[PDB]
Amino acid sequence: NDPCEEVCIQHTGDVKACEEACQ
């Protein structure tokens, strides 16, 4: 897993959110 998407999900838990916001 990526730290970015990990930081998001770990923060807002919004997977699909960081998924696109981080690609």
12: its two tokens = 């807002």
**Cβ pair 9, 21 in contact under 8 A:** no
For residue 22, give the nearest of 8, 13, 10 by alpha carbon. 8
d(CA 20, CA 8): 11
Technique used: NMR
Angle at 21 between CA 11 and CA 7, to 5 degrees: 25
Residue where the block lists tokens 């770990």: 10
**Cβ pair 8, 17 in contact under 8 A:** yes
**Cβ pair 15, 9 in contact under 8 A:** yes
**Cβ pair 2, 22 in contact under 8 A:** yes
- Give Cα separations from 20 to 8, 10, 11 (angstroms): 11, 16, 16
Residues in CB range of 13: below 8 A, 6 or more apart: none
6: its two tokens = 């990990």
